[PDB]
Each structure stands twice: as structure tokens, then as C-alpha cells.
Design a protein around this ligand. Sequence first.
Ligand SMILES: Cc1ccc(S(=O)(=O)Nc2ccc(F)cc2C(=O)O)cc1C
Length: 90
Amino acid sequence: SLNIITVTLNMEKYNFLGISIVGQSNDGGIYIGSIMKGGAVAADGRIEPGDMLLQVNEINFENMSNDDAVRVLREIVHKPGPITLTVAKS
Ligand SMILES: Cc1ccc(S(=O)(=O)Nc2ccc(F)cc2C(=O)O)cc1C
């Protein structure tokens, strides 16, 4: 049963999300492997390890390689403005 949540993070006080992403669509997809204390995601508290990362700032992370996902996340985090993550709960 579908369990989708959208998390908009104010990145005024945070310099990184503090997430590690594992796996990719072979369909499966890209998962939150771990969440690092000190990051925006940990502070917000809603996203948990095992959540599937679907979308960041209107970019579809479905059918995206792990390498590509890391590079896109880096580009987004290195630019100003709030970051909107949409995940499927485990
Ligand atoms: C410790 C640290 C800090 C910042 C970054 S980032 O600016 O390149 N952004 C990310 C990129 C990929 C990713 F899976 C997570 C992040 C993040 O902001 O936590 C990456 C990492 C590994």
C-alpha cells in the first residue's frame, strides 16, 4: 500500500542533508541507507533508513543510477534554497 511523504527542508542552518543512499533500479530503486546526526534530514526527523528516494526538487530519482543520484544530490545541496525530498516509507 502506497505510503509517500514530501519533506521540504530549510537549508539556512544546514550545509548538508546527512543521508547515505544505497542501491538503484535494476524494479527496486534508491534507498536511504543511513542518516547522519548534524544534517538537515536528521533534524527534521520524518525520513528514516529504508525509505525509497523518489524525487528531489522536481527531479525523478526513479530509474536513476546510484552514481547519477549522488552527483544530482551534490549539485542541489551546493546551491541555495530549500530542498524538497519525496520518499516511499518502508
Ligand atoms: C559528508 C558529506 C557532506 C556533503 C555532501 S554533498 O554536499 O555532496 N551532498 C550530498 C550528496 C550526496 C548524498 F548522498 C548526500 C549529500 C548530503 O548533503 O548529505 C556529501 C557528503 C558525503
